[PDB]
Amino acid sequence: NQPNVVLIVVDQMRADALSLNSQDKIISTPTLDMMASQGYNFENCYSPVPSCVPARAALLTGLDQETSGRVGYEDEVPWNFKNTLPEVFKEQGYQTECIGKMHVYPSRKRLGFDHVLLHDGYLHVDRKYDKSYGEQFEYSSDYLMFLKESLGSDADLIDDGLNCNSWEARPWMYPEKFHPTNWVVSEGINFLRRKDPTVPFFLKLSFEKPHAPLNPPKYYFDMYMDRLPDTLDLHIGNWEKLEHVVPDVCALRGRLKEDDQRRMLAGYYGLISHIDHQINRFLMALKEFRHDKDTIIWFISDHGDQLGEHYLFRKGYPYQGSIRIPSFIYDPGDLISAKKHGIKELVKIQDIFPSLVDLVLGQYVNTDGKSVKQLLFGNCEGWRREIHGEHSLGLDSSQYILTEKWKFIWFPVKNTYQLFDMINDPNEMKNLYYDKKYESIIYEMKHKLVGYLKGREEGFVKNGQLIQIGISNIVSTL
Amino acid sequence: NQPNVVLIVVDQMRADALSLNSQDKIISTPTLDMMASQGYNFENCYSPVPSCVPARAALLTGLDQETSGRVGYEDEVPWNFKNTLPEVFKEQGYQTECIGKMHVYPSRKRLGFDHVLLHDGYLHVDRKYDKSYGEQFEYSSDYLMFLKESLGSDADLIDDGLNCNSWEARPWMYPEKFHPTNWVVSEGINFLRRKDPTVPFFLKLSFEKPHAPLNPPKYYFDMYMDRLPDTLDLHIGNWEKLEHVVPDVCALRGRLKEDDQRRMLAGYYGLISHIDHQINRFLMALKEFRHDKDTIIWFISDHGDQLGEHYLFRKGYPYQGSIRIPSFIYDPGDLISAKKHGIKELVKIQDIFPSLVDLVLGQYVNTDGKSVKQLLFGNCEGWRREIHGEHSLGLDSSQYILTEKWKFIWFPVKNTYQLFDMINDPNEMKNLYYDKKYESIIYEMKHKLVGYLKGREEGFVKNGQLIQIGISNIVSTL
Amino acid sequence: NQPNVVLIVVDQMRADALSLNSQDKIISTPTLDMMASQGYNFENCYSPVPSCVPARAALLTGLDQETSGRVGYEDEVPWNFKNTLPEVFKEQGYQTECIGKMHVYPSRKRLGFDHVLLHDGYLHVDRKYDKSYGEQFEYSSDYLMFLKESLGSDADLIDDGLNCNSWEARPWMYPEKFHPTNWVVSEGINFLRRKDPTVPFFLKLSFEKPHAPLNPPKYYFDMYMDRLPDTLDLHIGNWEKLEHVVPDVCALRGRLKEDDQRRMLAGYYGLISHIDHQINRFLMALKEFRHDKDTIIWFISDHGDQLGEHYLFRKGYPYQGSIRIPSFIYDPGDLISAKKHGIKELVKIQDIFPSLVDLVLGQYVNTDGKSVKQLLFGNCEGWRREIHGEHSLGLDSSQYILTEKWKFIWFPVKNTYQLFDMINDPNEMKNLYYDKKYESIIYEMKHKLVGYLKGREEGFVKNGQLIQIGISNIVSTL
Amino acid sequence: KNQPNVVLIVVDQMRADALSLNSQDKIISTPTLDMMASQGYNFENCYSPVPSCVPARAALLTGLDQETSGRVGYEDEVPWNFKNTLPEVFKEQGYQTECIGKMHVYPSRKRLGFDHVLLHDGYLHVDRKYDKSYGEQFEYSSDYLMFLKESLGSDADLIDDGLNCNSWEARPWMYPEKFHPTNWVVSEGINFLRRKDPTVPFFLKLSFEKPHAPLNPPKYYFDMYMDRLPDTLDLHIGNWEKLEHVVPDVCALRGRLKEDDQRRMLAGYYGLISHIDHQINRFLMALKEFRHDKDTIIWFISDHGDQLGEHYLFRKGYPYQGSIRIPSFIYDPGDLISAKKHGIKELVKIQDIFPSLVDLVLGQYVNTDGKSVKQLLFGNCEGWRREIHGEHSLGLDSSQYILTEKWKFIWFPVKNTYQLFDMINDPNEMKNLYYDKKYESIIYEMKHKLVGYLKGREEGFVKNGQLIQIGISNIVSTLK
Ligand SMILES: [Mn+2]
Ligand SMILES: [Mn+2]
Ligand SMILES: [Mn+2]
Ligand SMILES: [Mn+2]
């Protein structure tokens, strides 16, 4: 009795960009809606350190950021992990495959996958004309090589002029059939065709979208340009500061012209609805292989996107737009006997690894994350009450504690604080830190932060108190 | 210590078609906005003789129109200049390259560029079936040859029926990847790949757009057709005359149906937003070559476009639509220590040459233009108070003086005058010449014009006074 | 001194579908507008027998319908004419060429053209699987052969399902560059390239459009679908009868759903604006060959299209929609010394032949049509006051007299009459025949009809009076 | 004013006797080169003193002797710190300068006086390492390889048929003939003529990578030689060669091939040369289309020869005629040089091209080691050299030699062995004369010349006025 596993990873998808989680239901995600509502949808799933590299180290190893050391974004840091999610499945006799984005270093280090067909998207560390030929450009991306075999050697990832950290958006400029999202599913179907029939499979399907460039196929772009509402709400509350400058094309903060905000949403949502159709394609193929009833699917995003919310862009922030991720288990064969329903407790990306090994392999994994199995059966025994996350981001480096009621944030280089009522202010528009009615929570929350940060090399804590630090103390890896 | 230089030239782009300079902010130029606002934006930059050939002679040589003799448009006039912008950089050890439009004569005369990959757009003097094979059609344009290699030998520049001096507009009829704007950036990236690594580079990227034909890719055309405002303001004031005829398809004056005015703007703005994305592509490539921090970029247009304003089309007029050009230095490596800000003083296209040689090479150039270096540091010492420009245009030949307060225009074949308050009437809608309250300015302004024109071969001045001349006296080259 | 001549023929274009002639100015024909307004525009030009074959026999020979015998539509009738328009030019030393639609029989009979590159559109008599191979389908049309060489042998003229006599419409389903309208201009440019340089040319450029199928390129179709006015006026007056049935897809009469009427107009107008751009392409090429100033251009349509007006479709009717045609001389080299202006007198398609031979060759042609030369110089000496036209159309066979004030119509199989005031009722909405105030005109008009029809084989006249005839008496050729 | 254009045509690894005009048996088909060489000035005794690619191309471009440049053997990625080069002097004098094809310089895209270089160096190991810089490797190092990927698809590469660039193996080109690198050089030379600056004269280097291996000419030319090469192929084995009797390495420096392999190698090599010959004719026809056939001077040269199995030796880097003697001629159909056209028998070095062209065309001196051949063209031998000192590092077979108009004297300093050949009566070097005492006087003089050239060299060839054996670790390819 060994079920197959498909781990579907998308990059930079917000939790509220799953229509089921959304409040306004504008985004079209009919396939993911069905999957999440029919399985176990994690309504409170979080990427504690919300950017590509630290989130993916956490996904693969189950490790908290202090254990792995990945407290912010840094490329080309060694991945010295043996006990990884695909490695444990391999040890138990699975064929292990990854199609798409790994974002590990060295880029083709397999970390337990038998075989990897790699496309990390646009990575500056793989697109330098003076670095090693075999590790750069079309030799670093099997999708880009496919693009050159398909469109000719002159084709490249940047042909339409959109930057991978930019809010600029416009439709995919080539035939739709060559889009990277289709390619992941096409190659996932090729894996099903060509896999070893004598063993079960663990397959990671890892889409680089909806991470920019924001270039969905024209159909999906025009869909949203035609129907997005007239006014687009940025959830501007009582704490945001506008610097009143023309936005950098790769801005981390600021405000767009309304037309630019509209195009950004149409690109971003368009990429998501496109992923949704292509995942449905993969589901249809699973059925052609008679694997629709013996396979368990977990969908997750590595982190969110601020998308202009609070005058912020990109990620690496403590706010919900960055840290809250969509996440659900889809179990159409009913291999998990727990009653299917939405899960409210605080789940971390670190929990996926031990949950999958427990639920599918019936084994314990010694790591920081914890198996959600008991949550599925309605038992919050031993479950965390809070999450400590953080991210290095220069002046805007953050440290935060999230509970089911509060989010307490500290910016240690600025030495400023925020407090939000997550139940009544889910979009974090009302900073409460300066209201004396919350003096008790704030003192308790500061006390818990000392608990997490005492002893950290950056010097956050001196003599049991939180102290402003200089920007030179911030590191992305411990 | 030798920074690289990229000189980006566009053709027929209005100063107010850079969104940053625009008042209504309708045009989408997010990349150029960022570049101009982050560097030094010249808010008062002018092409004194506003058409292709005299402006480009001024750009390349720094010479005033009396010195070069190019007082209007004329093709196939010798370019007997040795002291040119690329030549000085070559002398100081730079590799010099031009991709795109030169508009010199002979067409492939290099004037200091080591290598030129040429595309002048549609030029009547290069598209005559009875002129030399090697200098005509696809042998005159390396872009057109690319088009024939890409689409087949039957492809040509006029396939969709749009004329290069016409207000008619419609989307590019072929796949977007073959557009001439993409080709300039593709070939600029090929130059970066293949350049001599032992020396710095001076690269001119010279787009033929947004000069007509007005055929942007469909995406950009539809963008504006969908969102341009309902009513399009032509700034019709108290002096324009409407001749009440069906407009010639290559008209120099008149009025369009509202739908034709809308399509013209959608074509023109669409070409500009397309250039903007493609420049962003080139910026991304500069970073892949690790040249994003050791390169100085100057963006400029050779002249503007009347675009229907004042019932005028094309260029060669004294009005702001023709003479005011977008122009800025982008310095992301902070190689220039002056505080970055907008520059208000009167800058001419003649100033680019000596400014670049001063700022980058630390040398003096003996020419008519002057280095803007001191302006960047806040010092208007020795700066001009006024510009004398002109253009031959038959009956509408003009002579004008522009200061920071006034524009005084004389049409010497018509022997009529205009006066505009540039501060309070920036769109030149209120001719003041017949108001007696301005008798003193007008007399002074006429006196200055005698100063500029006394001795000119056309006979503008007889016995110290300005006199009407016959049309046969007008010349385009002295 | 021999000017070149280009005769541009379009098929089924209404006179009021030239924007200059139109009242509402909705249709976009900027190139034709300029040509017609700058030359001599014939505001009252008529195809007396308004369908393809009889109009083209009249165009080529100058003969009235009684002389040629072509009083209605009939295919495969011999063309036993020696004295034709191209033949006279050939005799005077011209190279003669036709590109496009001839509609003669045998199809490749040249009738004075040195060379013909043929595309008659969809012709039922050339699309029969049991008729001669060499004269059918792709062997009858050099455009269709081009389509098979371009798209593959499976391509055909009917691939999108639109019928050549149908009001159904939709965009061209293939790449725009393969449209038949582009092909005429491409092949007209090939003729200019390859012509005999030692002699002048007479070139007929004969477009099959805007005759259905109504499949313009997508750009032009969407243009009108987006901007045509909400309500489309059919000019329904006091005489039309609605048969209240679902319209045949090739209906000669009836009423369409509003959406179908909108799509028909968007297809029809779209084809016309497309022709307009492609004619501008040909004008640009004429200039590349230095023939823009030594060439005289005459534009004409063979007949109109009812387009749903008066609950009528197609042509072959006596009403203005069918009989009034656009027609103008374009003379940018000013080879004709007459002052350029619009021409109001009644001109027939029979007049083109003798006008061109008189104006360009300085010779008399013995035919029924008359040279318009004196009209251009303001002299209506000897000019007709009236036109007698007609068409065989079963029950709706017609006979009519048109003057500058009246149109009098007789339907001899129905034996009904109509009378319209052409000055005050230009759209023929008020039948006056039953108003006693017009008894004198009507009696005179009936008397003139006896004059035209006495002796005709059909038996219209018996003992000096007009008499109802049976449908079996109607013929299309005498 | 009225300055002539110049085309320097360089081929790689072509033997002097693989020009039919120079050959004894006239088997190889080079009709176009025969015409140009016999109608112009053919250098019958032109030499590459250090016969491998990099030292010969340094000598060609700079005019420097191997001791001045330090290039005494093959070595990649040595800096080219030369300002005074052949294209630079023409550029300085107002010429547009262009190279299409093989430069073999370092860094690969250093222009060294060319306004523009369209680069194809052939197969170079230092340009084909997956761990070296992307923009300098494989299809980013070779504009021909990029053209092949654009033409055949990204799958295509330079080694698809399995032939090694240092190998005697041969077979026809496996792709359509129109994509061959020899055609590409001429196609792009025509593109340059189309797009050049019309206001200045041009200096154009057309640098073919062939007939250097892979030995893969188009099928037509391969079959031509397989169908008609003689049954017996002479290796010119004399009284001094020694066979090692091992299976030959596919990139062997010495040995003996099976008959069929030797025949295939000749068919590939000759086939490549006859193919170049047709493609150069193509270029001549294009020159006339641009009306430049009578205002252009052409100099054809090879950088060094190829042993081709002769004396049981392969490749190059040897002191024998197969390696050091190169075809070389000036073609001047416009009669821009007034000297009567004839063949030139005196000793000419590859170092002489640079000063000769600058003298003949520009009327200037260059301060280099080579000398202008102009006086020879006019029949004046006054002061012209009577000997050449050459050498090459090649491990145990490292050589030092003196070539005069009559003798070649060779010293192998690691083996401490000597050879002497009569170049008039024994032009194929089959009879070593060193051990015959009749020649002791000549040998004495030749050793004394070598002492003069080699005194003070860092390798320690000379001690107390005498040539002495050196250890192999003393051998270097570039002097310090
Ligand atoms: Mn990510
Ligand atoms: Mn211009
Ligand atoms: Mn017709
Ligand atoms: Mn070589």
Side-chain angles (χ1 to χ4, degrees), chain D residues 230-254:
Chain D
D231 282 332
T232 289
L233 318 157
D234 194 359
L235 301 177
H236 295 142
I237 306 308
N239 71 345
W240 56 270
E241 305 89 325
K242 177 31 136 193
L243 250 198
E244 293 176 350
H245 288 279
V246 306
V247 177
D249 192 294
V250 305
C251 299
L253 279 161
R254 40 172 73 241

mmCIF file of all heavy atoms in Angstrom, chain D residues 230-254:
data_model
loop_
_atom_site.group_PDB
_atom_site.id
_atom_site.type_symbol
_atom_site.label_atom_id
_atom_site.label_comp_id
_atom_site.label_asym_id
_atom_site.label_seq_id
_atom_site.Cartn_x
_atom_site.Cartn_y
_atom_site.Cartn_z
ATOM 1 N N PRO D 230 46.492 8.767 -56.516
ATOM 2 C CA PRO D 230 47.289 7.616 -56.956
ATOM 3 C C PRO D 230 47.229 6.467 -55.960
ATOM 4 O O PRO D 230 46.932 6.638 -54.773
ATOM 5 C CB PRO D 230 48.711 8.185 -57.079
ATOM 6 C CG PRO D 230 48.718 9.407 -56.254
ATOM 7 C CD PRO D 230 47.318 9.971 -56.334
ATOM 8 N N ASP D 231 47.502 5.265 -56.476
ATOM 9 C CA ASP D 231 47.449 4.063 -55.646
ATOM 10 C C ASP D 231 48.521 4.082 -54.561
ATOM 11 O O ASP D 231 48.266 3.672 -53.421
ATOM 12 C CB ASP D 231 47.605 2.822 -56.521
ATOM 13 C CG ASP D 231 46.329 2.460 -57.245
ATOM 14 O OD1 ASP D 231 45.237 2.779 -56.723
ATOM 15 O OD2 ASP D 231 46.422 1.854 -58.334
ATOM 16 N N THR D 232 49.723 4.539 -54.899
ATOM 17 C CA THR D 232 50.824 4.643 -53.951
ATOM 18 C C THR D 232 50.974 6.091 -53.504
ATOM 19 O O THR D 232 51.049 6.998 -54.340
ATOM 20 C CB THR D 232 52.130 4.144 -54.574
ATOM 21 O OG1 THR D 232 52.067 2.720 -54.728
ATOM 22 C CG2 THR D 232 53.315 4.495 -53.681
ATOM 23 N N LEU D 233 51.000 6.307 -52.191
ATOM 24 C CA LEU D 233 51.197 7.636 -51.621
ATOM 25 C C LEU D 233 52.559 7.685 -50.934
ATOM 26 O O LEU D 233 52.798 6.969 -49.954
ATOM 27 C CB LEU D 233 50.049 7.992 -50.676
ATOM 28 C CG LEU D 233 48.661 7.584 -51.205
ATOM 29 C CD1 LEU D 233 47.633 7.424 -50.087
ATOM 30 C CD2 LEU D 233 48.151 8.557 -52.291
ATOM 31 N N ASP D 234 53.445 8.535 -51.454
ATOM 32 C CA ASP D 234 54.838 8.607 -51.013
ATOM 33 C C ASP D 234 54.944 9.401 -49.712
ATOM 34 O O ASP D 234 54.517 10.558 -49.646
ATOM 35 C CB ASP D 234 55.686 9.252 -52.111
ATOM 36 C CG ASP D 234 57.200 9.070 -51.910
ATOM 37 O OD1 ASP D 234 57.644 8.459 -50.912
ATOM 38 O OD2 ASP D 234 57.960 9.549 -52.779
ATOM 39 N N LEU D 235 55.534 8.789 -48.690
ATOM 40 C CA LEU D 235 55.795 9.451 -47.418
ATOM 41 C C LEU D 235 57.205 10.028 -47.340
ATOM 42 O O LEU D 235 57.565 10.603 -46.306
ATOM 43 C CB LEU D 235 55.577 8.468 -46.258
ATOM 44 C CG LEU D 235 54.163 7.859 -46.169
ATOM 45 C CD1 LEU D 235 54.068 6.837 -45.039
ATOM 46 C CD2 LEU D 235 53.089 8.911 -46.009
ATOM 47 N N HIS D 236 58.009 9.864 -48.396
ATOM 48 C CA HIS D 236 59.377 10.398 -48.474
ATOM 49 C C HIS D 236 60.253 9.905 -47.328
ATOM 50 O O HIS D 236 60.924 10.688 -46.658
ATOM 51 C CB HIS D 236 59.377 11.925 -48.511
ATOM 52 C CG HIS D 236 58.734 12.491 -49.732
ATOM 53 N ND1 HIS D 236 57.955 13.625 -49.701
ATOM 54 C CD2 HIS D 236 58.738 12.068 -51.018
ATOM 55 C CE1 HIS D 236 57.521 13.888 -50.922
ATOM 56 N NE2 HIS D 236 57.977 12.956 -51.738
ATOM 57 N N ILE D 237 60.256 8.594 -47.113
ATOM 58 C CA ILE D 237 61.006 8.012 -46.009
ATOM 59 C C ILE D 237 62.464 7.878 -46.434
ATOM 60 O O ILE D 237 62.779 7.166 -47.392
ATOM 61 C CB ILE D 237 60.421 6.655 -45.592
ATOM 62 C CG1 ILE D 237 58.916 6.777 -45.270
ATOM 63 C CG2 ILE D 237 61.181 6.115 -44.388
ATOM 64 C CD1 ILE D 237 58.554 7.887 -44.260
ATOM 65 N N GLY D 238 63.354 8.562 -45.723
ATOM 66 C CA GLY D 238 64.767 8.517 -46.041
ATOM 67 C C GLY D 238 65.586 7.705 -45.064
ATOM 68 O O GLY D 238 65.152 6.629 -44.647
ATOM 69 N N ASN D 239 66.748 8.230 -44.653
ATOM 70 C CA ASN D 239 67.761 7.457 -43.942
ATOM 71 C C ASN D 239 67.827 7.766 -42.454
ATOM 72 O O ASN D 239 68.769 7.331 -41.785
ATOM 73 C CB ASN D 239 69.139 7.672 -44.594
ATOM 74 C CG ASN D 239 69.722 9.082 -44.351
ATOM 75 O OD1 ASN D 239 69.023 10.011 -43.929
ATOM 76 N ND2 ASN D 239 71.020 9.241 -44.645
ATOM 77 N N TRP D 240 66.841 8.477 -41.907
ATOM 78 C CA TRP D 240 66.926 8.965 -40.536
ATOM 79 C C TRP D 240 65.669 8.764 -39.706
ATOM 80 O O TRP D 240 65.748 8.883 -38.476
ATOM 81 C CB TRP D 240 67.273 10.464 -40.523
ATOM 82 C CG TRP D 240 66.300 11.335 -41.309
ATOM 83 C CD1 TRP D 240 66.391 11.666 -42.629
ATOM 84 C CD2 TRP D 240 65.079 11.926 -40.830
ATOM 85 N NE1 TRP D 240 65.323 12.461 -42.997
ATOM 86 C CE2 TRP D 240 64.504 12.634 -41.910
ATOM 87 C CE3 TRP D 240 64.427 11.941 -39.590
ATOM 88 C CZ2 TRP D 240 63.295 13.345 -41.791
ATOM 89 C CZ3 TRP D 240 63.231 12.650 -39.471
ATOM 90 C CH2 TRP D 240 62.681 13.342 -40.567
ATOM 91 N N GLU D 241 64.520 8.508 -40.320
ATOM 92 C CA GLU D 241 63.282 8.357 -39.570
ATOM 93 C C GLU D 241 63.275 7.032 -38.813
ATOM 94 O O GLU D 241 63.905 6.054 -39.219
ATOM 95 C CB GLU D 241 62.087 8.430 -40.520
ATOM 96 C CG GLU D 241 62.062 9.690 -41.382
ATOM 97 C CD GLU D 241 62.820 9.527 -42.688
ATOM 98 O OE1 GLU D 241 63.859 8.821 -42.699
ATOM 99 O OE2 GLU D 241 62.381 10.112 -43.704
ATOM 100 N N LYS D 242 62.542 7.003 -37.705
ATOM 101 C CA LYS D 242 62.432 5.812 -36.870
ATOM 102 C C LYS D 242 60.962 5.621 -36.518
ATOM 103 O O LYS D 242 60.329 6.531 -35.975
ATOM 104 C CB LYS D 242 63.295 5.947 -35.599
ATOM 105 C CG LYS D 242 63.231 4.805 -34.566
ATOM 106 C CD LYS D 242 62.956 3.424 -35.174
ATOM 107 C CE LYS D 242 63.861 2.350 -34.565
ATOM 108 N NZ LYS D 242 63.844 1.061 -35.338
ATOM 109 N N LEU D 243 60.424 4.451 -36.850
ATOM 110 C CA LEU D 243 59.044 4.079 -36.558
ATOM 111 C C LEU D 243 58.949 3.428 -35.184
ATOM 112 O O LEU D 243 59.773 2.575 -34.842
ATOM 113 C CB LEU D 243 58.528 3.110 -37.617
ATOM 114 C CG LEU D 243 57.474 3.594 -38.596
ATOM 115 C CD1 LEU D 243 56.840 2.378 -39.211
ATOM 116 C CD2 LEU D 243 56.426 4.467 -37.907
ATOM 117 N N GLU D 244 57.930 3.803 -34.411
ATOM 118 C CA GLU D 244 57.766 3.275 -33.059
ATOM 119 C C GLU D 244 56.922 2.006 -32.994
ATOM 120 O O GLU D 244 56.971 1.309 -31.971
ATOM 121 C CB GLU D 244 57.149 4.343 -32.157
ATOM 122 C CG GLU D 244 58.065 5.532 -31.913
ATOM 123 C CD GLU D 244 57.401 6.619 -31.084
ATOM 124 O OE1 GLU D 244 56.165 6.529 -30.864
ATOM 125 O OE2 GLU D 244 58.110 7.567 -30.668
ATOM 126 N N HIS D 245 56.134 1.710 -34.039
ATOM 127 C CA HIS D 245 55.425 0.429 -34.209
ATOM 128 C C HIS D 245 54.314 0.225 -33.178
ATOM 129 O O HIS D 245 54.187 -0.842 -32.574
ATOM 130 C CB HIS D 245 56.396 -0.750 -34.197
ATOM 131 C CG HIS D 245 57.214 -0.837 -35.438
ATOM 132 N ND1 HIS D 245 56.735 -1.401 -36.601
ATOM 133 C CD2 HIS D 245 58.464 -0.397 -35.713
ATOM 134 C CE1 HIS D 245 57.663 -1.315 -37.540
ATOM 135 N NE2 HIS D 245 58.721 -0.711 -37.026
ATOM 136 N N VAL D 246 53.486 1.253 -33.006
ATOM 137 C CA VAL D 246 52.339 1.201 -32.115
ATOM 138 C C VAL D 246 51.096 1.589 -32.904
ATOM 139 O O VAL D 246 51.174 2.214 -33.966
ATOM 140 C CB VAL D 246 52.519 2.114 -30.877
ATOM 141 C CG1 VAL D 246 53.820 1.778 -30.157
ATOM 142 C CG2 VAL D 246 52.518 3.593 -31.289
ATOM 143 N N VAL D 247 49.943 1.175 -32.385
ATOM 144 C CA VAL D 247 48.665 1.651 -32.930
ATOM 145 C C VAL D 247 48.632 3.173 -32.820
ATOM 146 O O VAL D 247 48.911 3.719 -31.735
ATOM 147 C CB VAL D 247 47.481 1.006 -32.170
ATOM 148 C CG1 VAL D 247 46.143 1.533 -32.675
ATOM 149 C CG2 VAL D 247 47.529 -0.505 -32.304
ATOM 150 N N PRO D 248 48.351 3.912 -33.895
ATOM 151 C CA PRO D 248 48.437 5.378 -33.813
ATOM 152 C C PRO D 248 47.296 5.958 -32.990
ATOM 153 O O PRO D 248 46.134 5.578 -33.154
ATOM 154 C CB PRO D 248 48.370 5.822 -35.282
ATOM 155 C CG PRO D 248 47.575 4.742 -35.959
ATOM 156 C CD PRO D 248 47.997 3.458 -35.254
ATOM 157 N N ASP D 249 47.657 6.829 -32.051
ATOM 158 C CA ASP D 249 46.692 7.707 -31.400
ATOM 159 C C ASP D 249 45.925 8.479 -32.464
ATOM 160 O O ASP D 249 46.500 8.866 -33.485
ATOM 161 C CB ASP D 249 47.434 8.669 -30.460
ATOM 162 C CG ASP D 249 46.503 9.419 -29.511
ATOM 163 O OD1 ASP D 249 45.671 10.251 -29.979
ATOM 164 O OD2 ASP D 249 46.600 9.167 -28.290
ATOM 165 N N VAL D 250 44.621 8.701 -32.237
ATOM 166 C CA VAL D 250 43.864 9.408 -33.264
ATOM 167 C C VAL D 250 44.362 10.843 -33.426
ATOM 168 O O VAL D 250 44.122 11.449 -34.471
ATOM 169 C CB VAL D 250 42.331 9.373 -33.010
ATOM 170 C CG1 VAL D 250 41.825 7.908 -32.858
ATOM 171 C CG2 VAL D 250 41.944 10.216 -31.826
ATOM 172 N N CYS D 251 45.086 11.389 -32.436
ATOM 173 C CA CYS D 251 45.724 12.700 -32.565
ATOM 174 C C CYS D 251 47.250 12.600 -32.544
ATOM 175 O O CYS D 251 47.927 13.514 -32.070
ATOM 176 C CB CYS D 251 45.239 13.658 -31.476
ATOM 177 S SG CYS D 251 43.436 13.976 -31.543
ATOM 178 N N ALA D 252 47.792 11.514 -33.101
ATOM 179 C CA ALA D 252 49.219 11.219 -33.042
ATOM 180 C C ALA D 252 50.061 12.348 -33.628
ATOM 181 O O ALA D 252 49.665 13.023 -34.583
ATOM 182 C CB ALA D 252 49.522 9.934 -33.807
ATOM 183 N N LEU D 253 51.253 12.527 -33.051
ATOM 184 C CA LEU D 253 52.270 13.413 -33.599
ATOM 185 C C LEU D 253 53.226 12.700 -34.543
ATOM 186 O O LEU D 253 53.955 13.366 -35.296
ATOM 187 C CB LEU D 253 53.065 14.059 -32.460
ATOM 188 C CG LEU D 253 52.379 15.263 -31.816
ATOM 189 C CD1 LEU D 253 52.959 15.561 -30.432
ATOM 190 C CD2 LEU D 253 52.526 16.479 -32.746
ATOM 191 N N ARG D 254 53.252 11.369 -34.501
ATOM 192 C CA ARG D 254 54.130 10.575 -35.348
ATOM 193 C C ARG D 254 53.517 9.192 -35.514
ATOM 194 O O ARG D 254 52.662 8.772 -34.732
ATOM 195 C CB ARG D 254 55.555 10.449 -34.772
ATOM 196 C CG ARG D 254 55.665 10.261 -33.271
ATOM 197 C CD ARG D 254 57.122 9.944 -32.864
ATOM 198 N NE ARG D 254 58.018 11.096 -32.950
ATOM 199 C CZ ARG D 254 59.090 11.174 -33.733
ATOM 200 N NH1 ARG D 254 59.383 10.225 -34.610
ATOM 201 N NH2 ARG D 254 59.879 12.243 -33.651
#
